[PDB]
Design a protein around this ligand. Sequence first.
Ligand SMILES: O=C(O)[C@H](Cc1ccccc1)Oc1ccc(-c2cccc3ccccc23)cc1
Length: 255
Amino acid sequence: DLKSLAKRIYEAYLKNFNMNKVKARVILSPFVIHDMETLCMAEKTLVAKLVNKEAEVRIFHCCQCTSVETVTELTEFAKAIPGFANLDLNDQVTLLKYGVYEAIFAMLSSVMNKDGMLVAYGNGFITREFLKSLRKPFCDIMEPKFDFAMKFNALELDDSDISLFVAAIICCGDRPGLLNVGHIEKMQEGIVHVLRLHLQSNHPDDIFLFPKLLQKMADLRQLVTEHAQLVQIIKKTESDAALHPLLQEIYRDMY
Ligand SMILES: O=C(O)[C@H](Cc1ccccc1)Oc1ccc(-c2cccc3ccccc23)cc1
């Protein structure tokens, strides 16, 4: 009843996300981008988009491409959440608008380790060092995300846990401008119930796992606000680039 919903959500997650934590950890052992030199050759194989321009922009263009891919996937996933489809159109869109970036960063942790992160479906590996060497303000984009990932990854969740977490992020009753707050809260109530009990079953060796995750939720909301603004800065300060149209609509006057 509760069990089943966890199965249905986990399977939806498995069908709809190209990257998951089992597949990432397996990979994490091909091509390393660690300096401007190795970056260029990376751009002779991996990235088929910009295919000069300032290195900082090339990098984060490639990053926004993946954001958009994930927004697509999160939409597919959400449709498979029992009940989601039945929400008002405008609500489904508002939930995803305010939800996707929080969920993006949650799942990004899966491909990050203390050295760097998998990129482009796990065929690239850009070092944390390298990113930290990019000119301001670009060297300050990914650092807070690695910070979050190291704390998240310490909880040692698996995909079954993550799938329910991501569902709970999306189905959140307090996003600004919802119509049927009542119904979304009822949905949230159900999922969060399943999540807490699931964590207790799956990880009986950690009493406080569920509360730890609620704290991570708080962390991600702050992480997203900070990201929105640093994005805002870069839009004003740098025009050599341009933000993807779809991301422009998501970022718009939210936080
Ligand atoms: O939001 C995102 O998609 C990423 C963060 C992320 C990283 C890795 C995986 C998932 C998400 O942040 C971005 C940061 C910077 C730019 C960007 C690039 C070039 C020109 C720009 C001009 C103005 C504003 C922003 C510009 C795009 C996305």
